[PDB]
Amino acid sequence: SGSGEPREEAGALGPAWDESQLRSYSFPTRPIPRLSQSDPRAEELIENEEPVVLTDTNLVYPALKWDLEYLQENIGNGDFSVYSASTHKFLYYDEKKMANFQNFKPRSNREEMKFHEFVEKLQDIQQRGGEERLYLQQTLNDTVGRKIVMDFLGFNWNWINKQQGKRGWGQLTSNLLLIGMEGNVTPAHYDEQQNFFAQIKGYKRCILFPPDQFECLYPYPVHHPCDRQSQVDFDNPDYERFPNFQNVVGYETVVGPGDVLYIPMYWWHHIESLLNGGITITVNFWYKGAPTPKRIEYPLKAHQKVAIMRNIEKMLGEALGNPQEVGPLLNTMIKGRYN
Amino acid sequence: SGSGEPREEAGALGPAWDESQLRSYSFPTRPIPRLSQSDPRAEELIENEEPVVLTDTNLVYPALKWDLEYLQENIGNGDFSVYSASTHKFLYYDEKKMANFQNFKPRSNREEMKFHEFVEKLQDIQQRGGEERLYLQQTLNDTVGRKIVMDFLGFNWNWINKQQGKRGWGQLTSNLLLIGMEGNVTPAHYDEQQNFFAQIKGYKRCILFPPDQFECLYPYPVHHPCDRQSQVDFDNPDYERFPNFQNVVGYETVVGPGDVLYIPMYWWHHIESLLNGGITITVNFWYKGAPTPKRIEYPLKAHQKVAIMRNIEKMLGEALGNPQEVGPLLNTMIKGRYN
Ligand SMILES: O=C(O)CNC(=O)c1ncc(-c2cccc(Cl)c2)cc1O
Ligand SMILES: O=C(O)CNC(=O)c1ncc(-c2cccc(Cl)c2)cc1O
Ligand SMILES: [Zn+2]
Ligand SMILES: [Zn+2]
């Protein structure tokens, strides 16, 4: 199944999307549940750190009127990070780690520009039917214009603050605004914080994998610039290098305006703006996970084993004085001894 | 080369041993230098933590008269640990770690007995030409008889205490008495302390490998009872499991009465009592290595990387709550990511 039958928009406006707008992949999926925020099952899913789509939170209700016109006239004159790409895949590159791998070629290039400059490129590209793609990813702070501040104040802080308290999460670390073009793909990766993914404009297909599928998704080394992302090309998986990708099973859903997807900490997510669906707008909310208990029940959670692996890789990097010696030492430790 | 031409005993007594008494192995070797304790080159070798045979230390001069008769009549009535074996290989088993591996079969069995009982078995075995083998390995403390205490006090403590101070080593941790039968083999292993190997009776072939040949020698897992020993059977090496054993290069020498072999910390050693050479007697001295400097020069020593690997394996054992999960997690961390 996976995404399921497309939903019918109110007023008999027809289906919001069709299967032809979803890309084709090699793995099966099951659907993420779409529930009401008042449904106790949704409460149980979040508490158990499983994904759920909430349909009626009103989390970003005032932002549902947002489009390029409204934002350009009200966002203000500030710098917005804009990422470029020659293809549909926007692989992230941590610039601080580029020193560790010298012969690493970045595929996407970040650019700072005012918002009207961002709209111009989209208009310019659209005019000449170019194959270039863009993706705006900028934090929203107090600098933005007055009208956008009013909208932000109109978010449902009552609800999201309640969730913060119920789950004992830490503080809201950041709120990121995402504006992308149709067809854009953010490849599979995991984050170390709890995420509420608030869709505003357009539709996004979200494919999630639990932390226990670490073995099938082959993240980059911790010291690599692409740390936390899968090495597997979902469009052309190299089964000789990544054989357990043939065993991957995902959770998917299509989110539209007004939906909020809970992406639990350490869960992989692969996100694409539907083909031929126009631009997409999203706001993300990240919260630090709850602290680790004093006494651990044992039979450790998958995310706890991922955290251990990350720490091993980090400690060796420092202890050996060079991140490039991590791989050779780990292989020495394993070959003919644990494998 | 390796052992080199056998030495000529004084008084034209002929060669002390011949090549026919050495076992045959698949790897090459170079000779350990035999030097005088007054030779500054020997001082440089110890300081640089490289093996050397010292010919004239008088370290255990009073013990050179030791044999089974003398010891039985003077050692006293105490318990001596005696290890048994069905073959010539005496693989060590840490009894405290046997819990971690349940389906582990021990090949040697320890036995407590008085010294005259130990001589009786050697006499009994010799009588019936049995294939069983024995090895006495007991610490020497103040309980032993008066004459043996006098001999121990007659060791060259002036010299060995000077070495302790020069190298900044820690305290003498223990002194072990080793009495074995001809043909006995102590398989390749490394220790975490500095060792002075004082040969008393008979001849032993010592084959040493530097710490940087860790990759070729495939030690057991840290939590295995045979921790610190090589998995490779030197008599029948399994090159499919242990391919880099085909690249091993060793340092060897034959030690006789009055020789002292410095075995540096973390150096592998394989030790065999020569075939048809009678019983062998040895006393070992272990000293804690010097402390780790505050500021490390970097480009780390091979023994420092071994220590890191040991600590990783130990930390994971505790962190995961089960030593048997160490291997699976390490493979998960490496497969398709670092290998
Ligand atoms: O939502 C999408 O459509 C795709 N984007 C992400 O998934 C994402 N994930 C994480 C981050 C991020 C960036 C910086 C810090 C932190 Cl804690 C998180 C940004 C991100 O854009
Ligand atoms: O010398 C031989 O002929 C073979 N024996 C060893 O190599 C040896 N090595 C280490 C120990 C040992 C046993 C207990 C504690 C410590 Cl620190 C060391 C005993 C040992 O017997
Ligand atoms: Zn993310
Ligand atoms: Zn030893």
CSV table of N, CA and C in Angstrom, one decimal, chain A residues 25 27 32 51 90-91 135 176 178 185-197 204-211 213 217 228-230 232 234 248-253 261-272 282 284-286:
chain,number,residue,atom,x,y,z
A,25,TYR,N,10.3,3.4,-6.5
A,25,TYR,CA,11.4,2.9,-5.7
A,25,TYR,C,11.3,1.3,-5.6
A,27,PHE,N,11.5,-0.7,-2.9
A,27,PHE,CA,11.1,-1.3,-1.6
A,27,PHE,C,9.7,-1.1,-1.3
A,32,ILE,N,1.6,5.4,7.1
A,32,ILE,CA,1.6,6.1,8.5
A,32,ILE,C,0.1,6.4,8.8
A,51,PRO,N,5.8,7.3,14.2
A,51,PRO,CA,5.3,8.4,13.4
A,51,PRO,C,3.8,8.4,13.3
A,90,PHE,N,18.9,16.8,-3.3
A,90,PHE,CA,19.6,17.8,-2.6
A,90,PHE,C,20.3,17.1,-1.4
A,91,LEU,N,21.5,16.6,-1.6
A,91,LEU,CA,22.3,16.0,-0.6
A,91,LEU,C,22.9,17.1,0.2
A,135,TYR,N,16.1,25.4,-3.6
A,135,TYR,CA,15.5,25.0,-2.3
A,135,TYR,C,15.9,26.0,-1.3
A,176,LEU,N,12.5,25.9,11.1
A,176,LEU,CA,13.1,26.1,9.8
A,176,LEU,C,12.0,26.2,8.7
A,178,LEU,N,11.0,25.9,4.8
A,178,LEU,CA,11.4,25.2,3.6
A,178,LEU,C,10.5,25.5,2.5
A,185,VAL,N,13.9,16.4,-4.0
A,185,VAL,CA,14.1,15.3,-3.1
A,185,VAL,C,15.1,15.6,-2.1
A,186,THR,N,14.7,15.4,-0.8
A,186,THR,CA,15.7,15.5,0.3
A,186,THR,C,16.0,14.0,0.7
A,187,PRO,N,17.2,13.5,0.3
A,187,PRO,CA,17.5,12.1,0.5
A,187,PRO,C,17.4,11.6,1.9
A,188,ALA,N,17.3,10.3,2.0
A,188,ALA,CA,17.1,9.6,3.3
A,188,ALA,C,18.2,10.0,4.3
A,189,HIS,N,17.8,10.5,5.5
A,189,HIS,CA,18.7,10.8,6.6
A,189,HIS,C,17.9,10.7,7.9
A,190,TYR,N,18.6,10.8,9.0
A,190,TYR,CA,18.0,10.8,10.3
A,190,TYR,C,18.6,12.0,11.1
A,191,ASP,N,17.7,12.5,12.0
A,191,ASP,CA,18.1,13.6,12.9
A,191,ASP,C,18.1,13.1,14.3
A,192,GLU,N,18.8,13.9,15.2
A,192,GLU,CA,19.0,13.5,16.6
A,192,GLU,C,18.0,14.2,17.5
A,193,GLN,N,17.0,14.9,16.9
A,193,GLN,CA,16.0,15.6,17.7
A,193,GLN,C,14.6,15.2,17.2
A,194,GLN,N,13.6,15.4,18.1
A,194,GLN,CA,12.2,15.2,17.7
A,194,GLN,C,11.8,16.3,16.8
A,195,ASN,N,10.9,15.9,15.8
A,195,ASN,CA,10.5,16.8,14.7
A,195,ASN,C,9.0,16.8,14.5
A,196,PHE,N,8.5,18.0,14.4
A,196,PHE,CA,7.1,18.2,14.0
A,196,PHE,C,7.1,18.9,12.6
A,197,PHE,N,6.6,18.3,11.6
A,197,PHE,CA,6.8,18.6,10.2
A,197,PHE,C,5.4,19.2,9.7
A,204,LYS,N,3.8,16.8,0.0
A,204,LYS,CA,5.1,16.1,0.1
A,204,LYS,C,4.9,14.7,0.4
A,205,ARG,N,5.6,13.8,-0.2
A,205,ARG,CA,5.6,12.4,0.1
A,205,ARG,C,6.8,12.1,1.1
A,206,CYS,N,6.4,11.6,2.3
A,206,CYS,CA,7.4,11.3,3.3
A,206,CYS,C,7.5,9.8,3.5
A,207,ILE,N,8.7,9.3,3.4
A,207,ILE,CA,9.0,7.9,3.6
A,207,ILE,C,10.0,7.7,4.7
A,208,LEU,N,9.5,7.0,5.8
A,208,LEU,CA,10.2,6.9,7.0
A,208,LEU,C,10.7,5.5,7.3
A,209,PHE,N,11.8,5.3,7.9
A,209,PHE,CA,12.4,4.0,8.3
A,209,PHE,C,12.7,4.0,9.7
A,210,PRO,N,12.4,2.9,10.5
A,210,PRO,CA,12.8,2.9,11.9
A,210,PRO,C,14.3,2.9,12.2
A,211,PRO,N,14.7,3.2,13.4
A,211,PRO,CA,16.1,3.2,13.7
A,211,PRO,C,16.7,1.8,13.5
A,213,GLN,N,16.6,-0.2,11.1
A,213,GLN,CA,17.0,-0.5,9.8
A,213,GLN,C,18.3,0.2,9.4
A,217,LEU,N,20.6,0.8,5.5
A,217,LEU,CA,20.6,2.1,5.0
A,217,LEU,C,22.0,2.8,4.9
A,228,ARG,N,25.0,11.3,8.6
A,228,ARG,CA,23.5,11.1,9.0
A,228,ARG,C,22.7,10.8,7.7
A,229,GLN,N,23.3,10.8,6.5
A,229,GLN,CA,22.6,10.5,5.3
A,229,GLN,C,22.9,9.1,4.8
A,230,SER,N,22.0,8.5,4.1
A,230,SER,CA,22.2,7.2,3.5
A,230,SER,C,23.2,7.3,2.3
A,232,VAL,N,23.0,5.1,0.0
A,232,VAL,CA,22.3,4.4,-1.1
A,232,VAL,C,21.6,5.4,-2.0
A,234,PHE,N,18.6,5.9,-4.0
A,234,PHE,CA,17.3,5.3,-4.1
A,234,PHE,C,16.9,5.1,-5.5
A,248,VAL,N,14.9,-3.5,3.0
A,248,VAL,CA,14.4,-2.3,3.7
A,248,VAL,C,12.9,-2.2,3.5
A,249,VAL,N,12.2,-1.8,4.6
A,249,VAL,CA,10.8,-1.6,4.6
A,249,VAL,C,10.5,-0.3,5.2
A,250,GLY,N,9.6,0.5,4.6
A,250,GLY,CA,9.4,1.9,5.0
A,250,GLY,C,8.0,2.2,5.4
A,251,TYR,N,7.8,3.4,6.0
A,251,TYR,CA,6.5,3.9,6.4
A,251,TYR,C,6.3,5.2,5.6
A,252,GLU,N,5.2,5.3,4.8
A,252,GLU,CA,5.0,6.5,4.0
A,252,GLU,C,3.6,7.1,4.1
A,253,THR,N,3.5,8.3,3.7
A,253,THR,CA,2.3,9.1,3.7
A,253,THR,C,2.5,10.3,2.8
A,261,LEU,N,3.2,16.0,10.5
A,261,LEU,CA,3.8,14.7,10.6
A,261,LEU,C,4.8,14.7,11.8
A,262,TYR,N,4.6,13.8,12.7
A,262,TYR,CA,5.6,13.6,13.8
A,262,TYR,C,6.7,12.7,13.3
A,263,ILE,N,7.9,13.2,13.2
A,263,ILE,CA,9.0,12.4,12.8
A,263,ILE,C,9.9,12.1,14.0
A,264,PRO,N,9.8,10.9,14.6
A,264,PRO,CA,10.5,10.6,15.9
A,264,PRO,C,12.0,10.7,15.7
A,265,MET,N,12.7,11.0,16.8
A,265,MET,CA,14.1,11.1,16.8
A,265,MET,C,14.8,9.9,16.3
A,266,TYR,N,15.8,10.0,15.5
A,266,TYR,CA,16.6,8.9,14.9
A,266,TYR,C,15.9,8.1,13.8
A,267,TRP,N,14.6,8.5,13.5
A,267,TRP,CA,14.0,7.8,12.4
A,267,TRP,C,14.5,8.4,11.1
A,268,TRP,N,14.8,7.5,10.1
A,268,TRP,CA,15.1,8.0,8.8
A,268,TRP,C,13.9,8.6,8.1
A,269,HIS,N,14.1,9.6,7.3
A,269,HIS,CA,13.1,10.2,6.5
A,269,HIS,C,13.6,10.6,5.1
A,270,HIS,N,12.9,10.2,4.1
A,270,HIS,CA,13.1,10.6,2.7
A,270,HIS,C,11.9,11.4,2.3
A,271,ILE,N,12.1,12.6,1.8
A,271,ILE,CA,11.0,13.6,1.5
A,271,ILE,C,11.2,14.1,0.1
A,272,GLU,N,10.0,14.1,-0.6
A,272,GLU,CA,10.0,14.6,-2.0
A,272,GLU,C,8.8,15.4,-2.2
A,282,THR,N,6.9,24.3,3.9
A,282,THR,CA,6.9,23.6,5.1
A,282,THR,C,7.6,24.4,6.2
A,284,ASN,N,9.3,23.3,10.0
A,284,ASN,CA,9.7,22.3,10.9
A,284,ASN,C,10.0,22.8,12.3
A,285,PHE,N,9.7,22.0,13.3
A,285,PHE,CA,9.9,22.3,14.7
A,285,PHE,C,10.8,21.2,15.2
A,286,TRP,N,11.9,21.5,15.8
A,286,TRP,CA,12.8,20.5,16.4
A,286,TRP,C,12.9,20.8,17.9
